[PDB]
Amino acid sequence: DTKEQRILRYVQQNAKPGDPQSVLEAIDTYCTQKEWAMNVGDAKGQIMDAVIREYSPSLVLELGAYCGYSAVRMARLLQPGARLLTMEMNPDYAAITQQMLNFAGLQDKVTILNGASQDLIPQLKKKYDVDTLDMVFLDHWKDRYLPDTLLLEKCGLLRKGTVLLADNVIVPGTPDFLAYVRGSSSFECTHYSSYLEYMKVVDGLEKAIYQGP
Ligand SMILES: Nc1ncnc2c1ncn2[C@@H]1O[C@H](CSCC[C@H](N)C(=O)O)[C@@H](O)[C@H]1O
Ligand SMILES: Oc1cc(-c2ccc(F)cc2)cc2cccnc12
Ligand SMILES: [Cl-]
Ligand SMILES: [Mg+2]
């Protein structure tokens, strides 16, 4: 098996079906005690939770799903009827994520789109009936953060107040994105210093709120 299949099986055997908090705890335990994996983790996850609670977004887009940890973490905090769309290019990972969401009981709140963000973003309005997004979690390959932000804006998917929350702005880092949003009058930015998942290494999140053109 793969590490991702091992994570899934661990959840299935050490968490309670339909209990998202138990799922998060099982993943965190496995990734602390057995094998590291690139989930946002509990340190940064607590900051994400605080942000989600503040904004109560009705429609969230996540870029990069992996095994579903962040999707579970966000979706468990959504209000009834609110929704998450998550984009995942790797079909093996998409299948893990779906199974993870199913086990957590969150499958009605989340749609996992199997494809590359740069191909799926232009389809959101017509194919997926999206008007504008309330929040975007950027956590895919770091070189896509700026191009996809710019694409989201081109596609008319951002509105005044759309919250972008970007993982890993220190490690691995996303220097072009960070410079761009911090220098642009179209974003109001805040840095949340934290730690790399499961590691004593500094990392951080950036929140960038879109202000319009
Ligand atoms: N352009 C792209 N579109 C969609 N998925 C992408 C992508 N570039 C990378 N990915 C995916 O981005 C993921 C990054 S890891 C995502 C971790 C997850 N957000 C969590 O915290 O639990 C990987 O699964 C990778 O396959
Ligand atoms: O949270 C993440 C962490 C890392 C990462 C990988 C190796 C390291 F040594 C340190 C950090 C990569 C990611 C790629 C995509 C989404 N998130 C990532
Ligand atoms: Cl952590
Ligand atoms: Mg990350």
Tell which residue, 81, 74, 89, 39, has the closest CA to residue 58.
Answer: 81
Q: Is the CB of residue 139 below 6 angstroms from any atom belonging to ligand 2?
A: yes
Place of tokens 């761009």: 180
Q: Which of 66, 92, 98, 112 to mutate to test the pocket of ligand 1 (most atoms within 8 A of CB)?
A: 66
139 is catalytic: yes
Rg (CA), the chain: 16
C-beta of residue 139 within 8 angstroms of C-beta of residue 70: yes
Please, is 32 exposed, middle or buried when counting C-beta atoms within 10 Å of its C-beta (0-12, 13-18, 19+)? Answer: middle
Protein residue with its CA nearest to atom 13 in ligand 1: 64
Is 115 known to sit in a ligand binding site?
yes
Distance (Å) of CA 93 to CA 4, 34, 154, 182, 188? 7, 19, 28, 32, 33
**How many helices (H) and strands (E) would you count in the chain?**
8, 7
Which of 42, 197, 203, 206 is an active site residue?
197
Contacts of 115 (CB under 8 A, 6+ apart): 87, 88, 89
42 labelled catalytic? no
Ordered by where they begin, the domains of the chain are 1-213 (3.40.50.150)
| Ligand 1 and 141: CB distance under 6 A | yes
- The residue whose CA is least distant from atom 13 of ligand 2 is 38
Nearest-5° Cα angle at 89, 88 to 90: 95
Q: 89 is written with which tokens?
A: 């290019």
